[PDB]
């Protein structure tokens, strides 16, 4: 799903997606693309799509 992670998001939920995203980023032997993308998702979520946030 790295390229579309909405599907993961939908089924699993946002929190879980974030957690997995963190693991992929940290995960060792991974391609830079994967780690960077996961880092990007973790940090910024999906641009103009899913936003990453504290809500009152």
């Amino acid at each position: 799903l790295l390229v579309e992670i909405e599907r993961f998001f939908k089924l699993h939920q946002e929190d879980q997606a974030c957690a997995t995203c963190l693991i992929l980023a940290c995960s060792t032997c991974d391609r830079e693309v994967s780690a960077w993308a996961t880092r990007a998702f973790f940090r910024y979520g999906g641009e103009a799509q899913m936003r990453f946030t504290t809500l009152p």
């Binding site: 910024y44 641009e47 103009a48 799509q49």
Partner: protein
């Protein structure tokens, strides 16, 4: 014939040969099948590194390289995507460098831009390539500055306009510029205030 000058004129001569929609197709095949397009981008890539690492002869060669890519990409079809993916990445990198040339690569990039949805790589390049250096305050002027800083000279602007004209033709990504700045297409139009506001005071009709 390898000599840099012969090489550049060879590129130019072929451009002339590329004229028909039909001829353009053959020129496409000439490089692809029976010097390859890849070698060409490679040359551009190499020059790019040399240029930046460093910070007329090259202008001759590069100008010719671009003149040729431009001629064919314009007169082509599904093939456009193939050249697009490949010169697109390299051309983008070249644009970052100062170069005299900037405008010219923009013109070529535009030729590459496809009609459909798969504009996105191009928009990102452009936004990233205006946004990167600039520091934007929360106001409007800072945004204009980003464009003004990068698009310093007349050729740069004309090229930019051609690229933009093409991308804007019919579509772009949502929440463009997300992360870096206030998102959306709006700042680009503001930039035109800088341009066609100014136009009245051109040089040079």
């Amino acid at each position: 014939l390898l000599p840099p000058t012969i090489y550049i004129p060879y590129l130019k001569m072929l451009q002339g040969l590329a004229n028909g929609p039909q001829c353009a197709h053959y020129c496409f095949s000439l490089l692809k099948v029976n010097v390859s397009w890849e070698h060409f981008f490679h040359s551009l890539m190499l020059y790019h590194e040399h240029l930046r690492k460093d910070l007329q002869k090259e202008q001759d060669g590069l100008i010719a390289f671009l003149q040729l890519t431009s001629t064919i990409i314009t007169w082509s079809e599904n093939a456009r995507l193939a050249l697009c993916e490949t010169p697109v990445v390299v051309i983008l990198g070249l644009l970052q460098c100062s170069i005299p040339l900037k405008a010219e690569l923009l013109k070529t990039l535009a030729a590459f831009g496809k009609s459909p949805e798969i504009a996105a790589s191009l928009w990102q390049s452009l936004e990233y390539t205006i946004l990167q250096t600039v520091r934007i305050p929360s106001g409007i002027e800072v945004e204009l500055n980003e464009i003004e800083s990068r698009c310093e000279e007349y050729p740069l602007t004309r090229a930019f306009c051609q690229l933009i004209s093409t991308l804007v033709e019919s579509s772009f990504p949502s929440n463009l510029g997300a992360g870096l700045r206030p998102p959306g297409f709006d700042p680009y139009l503001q930039f035109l205030r800088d341009s066609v506001f100014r136009f009245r005071t051109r040089a040079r009709a």
